[PDB]
Design a protein around this ligand. Structure first.
Ligand SMILES: *[C@@H]1O[C@H](CO)[C@@H](O[C@@H]2O[C@H](CO)[C@@H](O[C@@H]3O[C@H](CO[C@H]4O[C@H](CO[C@H]5O[C@H](CO)[C@@H](O)[C@H](O)[C@@H]5O)[C@@H](O)[C@H](O[C@H]5O[C@H](CO)[C@@H](O)[C@H](O)[C@@H]5O)[C@@H]4O)[C@@H](O)[C@H](O[C@H]4O[C@H](CO)[C@@H](O)[C@H](O)[C@@H]4O[C@H]4O[C@H](CO)[C@@H](O)[C@H](O)[C@@H]4O[C@H]4O[C@H](CO)[C@@H](O)[C@H](O)[C@@H]4O)[C@@H]3O)[C@H](O)[C@H]2NC(C)=O)[C@H](O)[C@H]1NC(C)=O
Ligand code: PIO
Ligand code: PIO
Ligand SMILES: *[C@@H]1O[C@H](CO)[C@@H](O[C@@H]2O[C@H](CO)[C@@H](O)[C@H](O)[C@H]2NC(C)=O)[C@H](O)[C@H]1NC(C)=O
Ligand code: NAG
Ligand code: CL
Ligand code: CL
Ligand code: CL
Lengths: 332, 340, 328, 123, 332, 340
């Protein structure tokens, strides 16, 4: 320990954190691999997802090179504040923090050849704008931009260390509502007014599970559209019966549709779920108008009636069945 | 690389970051530039909007002149705290965030002439006073005003780097707007007089326009269908008091529910929005569609229906089958042409 | 003691773990569960408040004196090497700083260090919500060194590893604390092999609350629809209104049940019960529709059979339901 | 009905100073922007000054450093202190109040307009 | 700036911030003026209001007196950590923060005679207990208590700098729901167990705007109450109509209270809006018992009826109109 | 004031704030005084309460003696960090806040004898376990336990400054409770045994009583008026089957809605409250009313009403009009006298 103490003490003496490695020369290549702990919540209302990961950075700093110690020195994480580390930032994050119990979740592992391994445990709320025109049968593509703030491509270079295996742990993620179809890694350059900057992009193609929405939303909407057909087997004289039965279906369809928008942002377009609820409402509304037409013909035009009922008992179950065929094939 | 270390030691030696450049000698001129990475969502309840920007500031500090191999020192954001930087704050900012994940999102570049570029990544929540009188067909000019907190106009003046229309840039991909459309922005400069003196204020007004698609689907259509639904009872025989009673009663109950939940998207303003008038008129139609039946039932001498002497079709019913649909259609043309 | 403290820290390098080039640092851990907070099934989290105690030997902290133990507050904690123990399944964890940092540090003359601190942890406890609300869970709490692998830091329990309190002041409303076990393993990561210590708390849900809110109200709607069977025939506005209003009520009741669960794609036990209850209320309205049409246009005794089968079929389902899930 | 009545002066000797005033009625313009416009004969309306709810004053280039705008929020009025007048300043001065959409310098962004106080400067 | 650099260095050389100005002598007179930026949100649920202001303090420190320079030295806000500042705190404040973007919103402006102008931009959520007995026709009085924590009246004195004109921007405030009737500035001493401390109180008398509540609850309560009278124009033999009409209005009155009780805290007393809803429920309930009385008479007491209907067609509209007149005159 | 600079420089010269006063000589005795500036609201969902106190502590440190012009040094709170202070923490404290606007809300006073007074302004959120069996007619004794974290009773003991009853003072105007009433408090010391040793624990039980006013208006009155509403169907003719069915159906559903909404005000505990039994009984009365009409409709031979052979008023109706109102009144007397 006496010799290891001397080695670490002499490295930090004269070390200049204000200057990146090879300040006047070639860019310092920074390798990044991510181990994803879990994706917590994917909010359509807030248009963001919360992600926990073990963010690790790799770079060689010849100033931090030591010999005579055949070990990889895992220094206490309080030394990270005395060393140059890349100014990596996530462009599309809203709120982020590094966990700090029982200490700050950092690691510094020096290597004899001067390499620095820098692991951070970060919970990130990243912005993910979602196109909800096929909701809930939609596939979402949420990204995570990784960029250098102050260092241009002349100063720093980012690569996914390990290639396509740089990001791990995705296969273990179990979102309650979604399913991670795949992920991919993109390395490119982004140009701003202040120069060109390297960018790493991690993106997941989320696929929404339809199972929950079938029971909660789709199935009750179908049954109510069937109960509205019960009135077609009711005598036309039962005004207080069919109208009471007919109206309640109309009110429920309005209630179901207007109580579903609460859990969603105020997007100014019709989703796939809204198109279906509107489709059922039209059949339900015409079911109530079917009796209003019969009650008008029998009494208002008294001075055929049963034909409309028999005709309704076939076309209404047929058109709605036809409606499901067009709807589901167009969306699945 | 001790050559560049000597330069940084030389610059900060005898450097007092408590004094602005040219203190007591001239006016410190700060040239600013804004790149909107993403124009965040607009909150109607709090009357605030979120913006995510690269706030770039440029000014000349002659104390930071150097001669070296490199003309521009692309230094670390740690160096910023050791150098005088302008104390820019946002006048209408509510609660802003200067991101520092994984490091402080700041850059500091010192060209050899002494010019400093000092850009930061900020998330700003700003107050946007909204006149929700034509809601939901309303547009707002949400401002974004900033200036020196401590230094007066005689000490620090702000200026736009490029032409004012070109010194605020919005990224095409970054637009976190759900129910609004960003028409554009007008860039301006002004003056404020507080109890501590004059202060130059840089302002940017973003011209948002609310998209009406959401409210048509969720509020206007249920109100319109309820009015049509209530008028279905006009085609029912008068001897069906229970049926037409349920028709009128349920629709009035429905309208009351819509009239209450329609305010949940807005702060409790004391005036009436353009949507309130539509609900009020729809309430008037649905309420009157039951008074119309309350009058036909008053003149329904018989109780048995057609299949003796039978009741005649109400003259009120025949007219209500035309006047009520017609007036609502006339009201719709007047209402929509007024606001669109 | 002032002389002793200055002697210890003089020439002390807290960046280096004890026996950095010699042995793995053996760390003995003790946990006292002050309380277990509410179990949030929506976010799959639970909160726990503990007094996390770690013991290890640092030869740099050996002193020869007659006092034999140094008792210190949190001021000394930052001056010496402290294990970087974090919590792997922790979403949000906090120390306590009121009125001062809730930390304790004791140093014996032989170098043994005891470091206790108070923690509030929102550990991530993945829940298989099948059999809900008759489900049971074993919530884990993992911790390990963040940067020191198994060749540098080793964790080991004690004889009194986990100690629990009254278990009555705990905020376990829907669950009851039933069990507790401690494990140890080595998990391979990109940075190396890390010794992981995991505490498992066994929690079984109490079904009483959901019976009040879901099972009882749903059952009474099933009985409510049966009333239309005893209602005399030809009362079309009476039974039809009764039939539809139960289905409308069941739809609202179905939504309320899901409000306590995340939007999972698998049918929970409670959802099956509501789905079955939705069938009976639907069957009653269909039953009257079939009877009304045939009479208006043996089968006519369908009311008599309905008064027998429906009160019995629902009972038959209850026997199967309240056995496959409660037991077996 | 909202009224923007403008008082002040109509004639002034060259080199003098004038203080036009404008009292609002029927609506509180605390959250609006109150501005001053002038329209010389045979010419378009020229923006002069404007003060927002945050007491921020915007001036036109030709009148910067001469004309000072100042609102009284309690009295719901805006006053322009004309100074250093020139014969070229002879015009009809207008009082405007509006939200400021697309504007704060555009005469079309103000919904409520005043009557117009003629000001004449003679040498 | 070389001369100015020397002068500021001399001020902070030997400067002890642990001791107040005139530590052993007369109390330091600290003048306070407030420039209110906005009043964010008044919540009855949390019994608090949020306030953003340009809080400023004034005091003369002879140790910070500089001669030769004829300017008012505005220093960088980081110098406040090296100067003595009053330990001013807000007693009823729950959650306060000084804004820190782009830097911390502070100003230190030394003046040659030794005066110190020290301004902060503070957002304060202060407690304001409310008397909701006359809600929503109520005037609230929300204050802001300003006090020194450690220094008694023997070591510090608080006065409003500028008298009644020490608080500005109140006229520019436009609360959507309330209306600032007036404001008062109070200077007084408060005795605790550790001595008497100076206190400044800034109080606002907010007045609620009834316009929103009329469109939200008052009008639907009236129309539903008017709706229940329609049963007075229906033949008594129409059981399915009058009962359904009467019962529905009874439910809605209870239902309307649901959308109103959740918007307020669980206070134990009766509000002025509850008095109206209880008043409306009595009429709606009686309009239903009027029919049950008629139905029992014609059927359970058969073996005048229309008299009760016609009498109720006038008494109920008249009594309810009288009920409003008594209610509104008392509360307005 | 260079004289008082020398005194402070002398006091902290060689001061070791890692060692409690009288280390190895005696037991550091700390006198605790609490002034509750406001007793904050009580949150049953979190089973905790808020409280805002001037947490005062006094002890004696001989290293802090002086002979100066004045007898008490009212120092800035900066001095606290350089001086040993007790490591007091709240055993049931969930998440407390030490206030910082505009400076750290602390005071430190050193008398020439060596005694220190060190008060802090905190917002303590402490756990208050509750037994909601009698809800809402229930009372609670919310505790406030505190003591040293690191120092056992052989090193740091606590005692109240004045008499225990007169060491916790609640401000007369400082009550932020809405549905509770603070019925005084009891103050007691104690000893806690743990795995590291014995610790002195100061305890304070604030006694709260829930005010029943809110729950009577929102729960008991709607339930009572629902029971009365169902019994109206006992006064209707047996021939109006749809009208009486609507009565029973509506009231049963109304009871169900009131049942669920009532539980939304409480933590989802696994036992029935007192308010639960009242809802259950009110459900039974409403349910039995529709059971009664099911019997009346069963024994209704004819489907036409009196204005031939007409139906007679059911004997079940006559007793229902007397039994049901009387039994419900009996239950109310038994239920209310049971708790009140
Ligand atoms: C992005 O920017 C933000 C904003 O700048 C960064 O957030 C800051 O992060 C830093 C670094 O972690 C923090 O500094 C340390 O804080 C700890 C913890 O106390 C602070 O935080 C508490 C709450 O933290 C929780 O929430 C925050 C978010 O709100 C979260 O970030 C955090 O992880 C956690 O979840 C507060 O409650 C606490 O306030 C209390 O204490 C204040 C004084 O500290 C007081 O003013 C308040 O009124 C209140 O009572 C406080 O803000 C500190 O413990 C730590 O200080 C110790 O360690 C540093 C070295 O790291 C050392 O220099 C200090 O001197 C000190 O060490 C002394 O004390 C130790 C503990 O007793 C002891 O072990 C040591 O031995 C040492 O004692 C020795 O010296 C003293 C004299 O100094 C002597 O008397 C003794 O005898 C002995 O010899 C640091 O202050 C910031 O607090 C935090 N700020 C905010 C607003 O969050 C964020 O990290 C950035 N992110 C990135 C990615 O860059
Ligand atoms: C909200 C509007 C309220 C308007 C209230 C208006 C109240 C008002 O003035 O009503 C009178 C009358 C009602 O006539 P309506 O057709 O409703 O009723 C007929 C009328 O009473 C005849 O006199 C009866 O015949 P008779 O006696 O045996 O010969 C006939 O019965 P029968 O022949 O089967 O036996 C009844 O059905 O209305 C109008 O003439 C048009 C008014 C249009 C008004 C404007 C409508 C838009
Ligand atoms: C919850 C308890 C349920 C108990 C259910 C008990 C059910 C039960 O056993 O009912 C039988 C009978 C029905 O009473 P109710 O008056 O309703 O029925 C009359 C009865 O059937 C007569 O016999 C009929 O006349 P009759 O034959 O031609 O001469 C008469 O017809 P009409 O003359 O109109 O043409 C019917 O209306 O009620 C009792 O004996 C007192 C019950 C007191 C019950 C008191 C309950 C508190
Ligand atoms: C220090 O770390 C380096 C890098 O991880 C280790 O070198 C690797 O060792 C593994 C196992 O033998 C090989 O599969 C890799 O190919 C090596 N990589 C390189 C770049 O050499 C090294 O063994 C570690 N040192 C110690 C003492 O464990
Ligand atoms: C768990 O704790 C017990 C003591 O409670 C101890 O004997 C055992 O070794 C620990 N570890 C395992 C894996 O059981
Ligand atoms: Cl938006
Ligand atoms: Cl729980
Ligand atoms: Cl309370």
């Amino acid at each position: 320990m006496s010799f290891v103490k001397e080695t670490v003490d002499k490295l930090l003496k004269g070390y200049d954190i204000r200057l990146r490695p090879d300040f006047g020369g070639p860019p310092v290549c920074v390798g990044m691999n991510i181990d994803i702990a879990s994706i917590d919540m994917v909010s359509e209302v807030n248009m963001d997802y919360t992600l926990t990961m073990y963010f690790q950075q790799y770079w060689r700093d010849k100033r931090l090179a030591y010999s005579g110690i055949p070990l990889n020195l895992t220094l206490d994480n309080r030394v990270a504040d005395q060393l140059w580390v890349p100014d990596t930032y996530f462009l599309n994050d809203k709120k982020s923090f590094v966990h700090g119990v029982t200490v700050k979740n950092r690691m510094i592992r020096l290597h004899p050849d001067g390499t620095v391994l820098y692991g951070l445990r970060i919970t990130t709320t990243a912005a993910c704008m979602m196109d909800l025109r096929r909701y809930p049968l939609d596939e979402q593509n949420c990204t995570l931009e990784i960029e250098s703030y102050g260092y241009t491509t002349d100063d720093i270079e980012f690569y996914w260390r390990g290639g396509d295996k740089a990001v791990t742990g995705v296969e273990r993620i179990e979102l309650p509502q979604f399913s991670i179809v795949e992920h991919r890694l993109v390395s490119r350059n982004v140009v701003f007014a202040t120069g060109a900057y390297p960018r790493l992009s991690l993106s997941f193609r989320l696929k929404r599970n339809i199972g929950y929405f079938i029971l909660q939303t789709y199935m009750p909407s179908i049954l109510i559209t069937i109960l509205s057909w019960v009135s077609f087997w009711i005598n036309y004289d039962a005004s207080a019966a069919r109208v009471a039965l007919g109206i309640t279906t109309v009110l429920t369809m309005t209630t179901i549709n207007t109580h579903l928008r609460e859990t969603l942002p105020k997007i100014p377009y019709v989703k796939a779920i809204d198109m279906y609820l509107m489709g059922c409402f039209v059949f339900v509304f015409l079911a109530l108008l079917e009796y209003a037409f019969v009650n008008y013909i029998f009494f208002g035009r008294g001075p055929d009636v049963n034909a409309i009922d028999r005709w309704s008992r076939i076309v209404f179950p047929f058109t709605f069945s036809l409606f499901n065929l067009v709807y589901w094939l167009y969306y699945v | 690389t001790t050559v560049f270390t000597r330069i940084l030691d030389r610059l900060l030696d005898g450097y007092d970051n408590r004094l602005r450049p040219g203190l007591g000698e001239r006016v410190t001129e700060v040239k600013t530039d804004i790149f909107v990475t993403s124009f965040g969502p607009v909150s109607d309840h709090d009357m605030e909007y979120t913006i995510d920007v690269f706030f770039r500031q440029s000014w000349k500090d002659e104390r930071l002149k150097f001669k070296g191999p490199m003309t521009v020192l692309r230094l670390n954001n740690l160096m910023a705290s050791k150098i005088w930087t302008p104390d820019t704050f946002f006048h209408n900012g509510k609660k802003s965030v200067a991101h520092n994940m994984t490091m402080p999102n700041k850059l500091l570049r010192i060209t050899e002439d002494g010019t400093l570029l000092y850009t930061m990544r900020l998330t700003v929540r700003a107050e946007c006073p909204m006149h929700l009188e034509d809601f939901p067909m309303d547009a707002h000019a949400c401002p974004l005003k900033f200036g020196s907190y401590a230094y007066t106009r005689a000490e620090v003046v702000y200026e736009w780097t490029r032409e004012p229309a070109r010194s605020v840039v919005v990224a095409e991909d970054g637009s976190r707007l759900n129910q609004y459309d960003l028409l554009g922005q007008t860039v301006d400069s002004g003056i404020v007089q507080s109890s501590t003196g004059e202060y130059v204020v840089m302002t940017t007004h973003f011209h948002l326009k609310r998209k009406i698609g959401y409210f048509v689907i969720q509020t206007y259509l249920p109100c319109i269908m309820t009015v049509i639904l209530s008028q279905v009872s006009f085609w029912l025989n008068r001897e069906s008091v229970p049926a037409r009673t349920v028709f009128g009663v349920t629709t009035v109950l429905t309208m009351t529910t819509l009239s209450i939940s329609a305010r949940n998207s807005l702060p409790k303003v004391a005036y009436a929005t353009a949507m309130d008038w539509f609900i009020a008129v729809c309430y008037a139609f649905v309420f009157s569609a039951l008074i119309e039946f309350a009058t036909v039932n008053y003149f329904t001498k018989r109780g048995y229906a057609w299949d003796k002497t039978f009741n005649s079709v109400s003259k009120i019913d025949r007219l209500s089958r035309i006047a009520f649909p017609l007036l609502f259609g006339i009201f719709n043309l007047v209402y929509w042409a007024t606001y669109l | 003691v002032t002389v002793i403290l200055n002697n210890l820290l003089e020439g002390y390098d807290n960046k280096l773990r004890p026996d950095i080039g010699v042995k793995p640092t053996l760390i003995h851990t003790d946990m006292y569960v002050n309380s277990i907070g509410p179990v949030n099934a929506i976010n799959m989290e639970y909160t726990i408040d503990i007094f996390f105690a770690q013991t290890w030997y640092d030869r740099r902290l050996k002193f020869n004196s007659t006092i034999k133990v140094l008792r210190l507050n949190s001021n000394m904690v930052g001056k010496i090497w402290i294990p970087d123990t974090f919590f792997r399944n922790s979403k949000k964890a906090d120390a306590h700083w009121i009125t001062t940092p809730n930390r304790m540090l004791r140093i014996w003359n032989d170098g043994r260090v005891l470091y206790t601190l108070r923690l509030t942890i929102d550990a991530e406890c993945q829940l298989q919500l099948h059999n809900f609300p008759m489900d049971e869970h074993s919530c884990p709490l993992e911790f390990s060194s963040y940067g020191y692998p198994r060749e540098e830091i080793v964790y080991q329990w004690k004889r009194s590893s986990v100690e629990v309190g009254d278990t009555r002041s705990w905020r376990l409303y829907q669950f009851s604390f039933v069990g507790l076990r401690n494990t140890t393993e080595v998990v391979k990561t990109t940075s190396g092999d890390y010794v992981v210590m995991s505490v498992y708390f066994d929690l079984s849900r109490r079904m009483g609350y959901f019976t009040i809110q879901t099972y009882i109200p749903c059952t009474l709607i099933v009985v409510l629809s049966w009333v239309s069977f005893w209602i005399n025939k030809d009362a079309v506005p009476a039974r039809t209104s009764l039939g539809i209003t139960t289905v409308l009520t069941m739809t609202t009741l179905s939504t309320i049940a899901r409000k306590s669960l995340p939007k999972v794609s698998y049918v929970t036990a409670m959802d099956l019960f509501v789905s079955v209850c939705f069938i009976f209320v639907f069957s009653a309205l269909v039953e009257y529709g079939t009877l009304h049409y045939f009479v208006s246009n043996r089968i006519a005794k369908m009311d008599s059979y309905a008064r027998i089968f429906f009160p019995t079929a629902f009972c038959l389902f209850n026997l199967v339901y309240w056995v496959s899930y409660l037991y077996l | 009905q909202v009224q923007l009545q403008e008082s002040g002066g109509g004639l002034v000797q060259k080199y003098g100073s004038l203080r036009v005033s404008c009292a609002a009625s029927g609506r509180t313009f605390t959250t609006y922007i109150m501005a001053w416009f002038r329209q010389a004969p045979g010419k378009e309306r020229e923006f002069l000054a404007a003060m927002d709810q945050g007491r921020i004053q915007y001036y036109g280039d030709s009148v910067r450093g001469r004309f000072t705008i100042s609102r009284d929020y309690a009295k719901n009025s805006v006053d322009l202190q004309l100074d250093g007048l020139r014969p070229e300043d002879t015009a009809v001065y207008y009082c405007a109040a509006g939200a400021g959409f697309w504007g704060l310098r555009t005469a079309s962004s103000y919904h409520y307009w005043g009557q117009g106080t003629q000001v004449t400067v003679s040498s």
